[PDB]
Amino acid sequence: SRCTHLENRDFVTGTQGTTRVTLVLELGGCVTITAEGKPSMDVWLDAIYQENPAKTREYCLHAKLSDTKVAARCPTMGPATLAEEHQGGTVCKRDQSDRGWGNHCGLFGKGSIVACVKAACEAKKKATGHVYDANKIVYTVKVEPHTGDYVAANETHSGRKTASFTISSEKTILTMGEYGDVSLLCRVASGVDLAQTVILELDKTVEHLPTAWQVHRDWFNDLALPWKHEGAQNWNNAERLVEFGAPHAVKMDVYNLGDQTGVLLKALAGVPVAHIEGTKYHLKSGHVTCEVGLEKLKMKGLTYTMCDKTKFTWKRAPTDSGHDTVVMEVTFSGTKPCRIPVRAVAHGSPDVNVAMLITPNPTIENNGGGFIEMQLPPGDNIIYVGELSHQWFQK
Ligand SMILES: *[C@@H]1O[C@H](CO)[C@@H](O)[C@H](O)[C@H]1NC(C)=O
After folding, report:
1. Which range marks the domain in which residue 107 is found?
2. Shared-domain flag, residues 113 and 261
3. For ligand 1, is residue 155 a contact (CB within 6 Å)?
4. Which of 246, 353, 371, 387 is deepest in the core (most CB within 10 A)?
5. Which atom of ligand 1 approaches the CA of 152 most closely?
6. Residue 3 CA to ligand 1 centre (angstroms)
7. Rg (CA), the chain
8. Do 215 and 312 have their domain in common?
9. CA distance readout (Å), 270 to 92, 126, 215
């Protein structure tokens, strides 16, 4: 059962008459649903994402400066000017330098000086923000029936089904193989509010970093870095990463404040990560409430005869699942298919069956069955699968 793979697992149980079940599925969680006369089902919210979300601003973390130009005039010669002062994509500073005979001016005094640099951004040194549209966000829910077959996490359960939901398409009917149809009504509106969320992306090809972060819109909009719209050619406020030195005669130095990535990363510690897979921008945390309709589900193998009580052996002896249940797997050497005669008694009371089965109507099919998950009361018990027995101390 898929839910046995994780630590975060909930059990939902429907009694007599319970045909519908309302669950709050959370990313990283898993729910096992059990109900009288119904095959058990594992359900979980698998992903929350939007393909190609809209991009808000792009910020530059490392300025690439080039073509530094300086123009200086002697004290009586008027303002110094450069064509660059009027071009976008350049950062300039006008100042005054001390001039005199030493640097070829007729008078000793203040002379106009102006320096400009072309400012661009280093390749792969942008920080881009993305915003979600509640109407385009997709919630993916997976359902897997309890078939008495154990499948590891790196393996694929042939009976697992997937359902996708958007605000405009909240209901799906899934056919669970021979178990019947299950209906899922999940409301995206009951999900995570995304108004103040921005998915921040740096360079997703960097190997030792998460591919994205989920940050607050107000924090993102206040970053003190050069910015522009995707598609725009030049950067606004490029001066944020450039400093000019005090001028001396006909020269003025231009300083680059360096790569701000390290600075940003310190700010991002403790911020939740997100994930990008191609064009899909995923949230790594979130939840949604769904209504599961069980009325069309039917159990499998109810009319088989009981398996020969003499032909069972333990493939995997009873073991603690970590969810206060016991898991085990048996092998049957008799004729299939048949119902597995499972029960358990408390040490000293051989007459009362104390086993509460999670796995519905355990059966050995022609090519499956054998895995059983059950709950037992605290203390010493003995598990029986026909004549096959096993001691079990619960707790
Ligand atoms: C799953 O992982 C195990 C252990 O690493 C390996 O032996 C097995 O072949 C894997 N199976 C698949 C389908 O990846």
Report:
1. 63-121+236-256
2. no
3. yes
4. 371
5. 1
6. 19
7. 34
8. no
9. 38, 21, 10
Evaluate: CB of 154 within 6 angstroms of ligand 1: yes
Q: Are residues 315 and 374 in the same domain?
A: yes
Say how far apart CA 92 and CA 114 lie, in whole Å: 7
Claim to verify: residue 171 and residue 311 sit in the same structural domain: no
CATH number at residue 337: 2.60.40.350
Give the resolution value in Å.
Answer: 1.9
CA distances from 45 to 8, 29, 48, 49, 185 (A): 12, 7, 8, 12, 13
Pair 68, 251: CB distance under 8 Å: no
CA of 154 to the centre of ligand 1 (A): 6
What is the rounded distance in angstroms from the CA atom of residue 230 to the CA atom of residue 55? 7
Which CATH number goes with the domain that contains 276?
Answer: 2.60.98.10
Ligand 1: centre distance to CA 45 (Å): 25
Q: Write down the experimental method used for this entry.
A: X-ray
Instruction: Give the residue, out of 5, 150, 154, 157, with the most ligand 1 atoms within 8 A of its beta carbon, to mutate for a pocket test.
Output: 154
What backbone phi and psi angles, to 5 degrees, belong to 178?
-85, 0
* Tokens coding 157: 């359960």
Domain shared by 334 and 390, yes or no: yes
Which of 256, 287, 312 terminates a domain? The answer is 256
Q: What CATH number does the domain containing 231 carry?
A: 3.30.67.10
Q: Could you identify the atom of ligand 1 that is nearest to the CA of residue 155?
A: 13
Q: In angstroms, rounded to a whole number, what is the distance separating the alpha carbons of residues 281 and 51?
A: 6
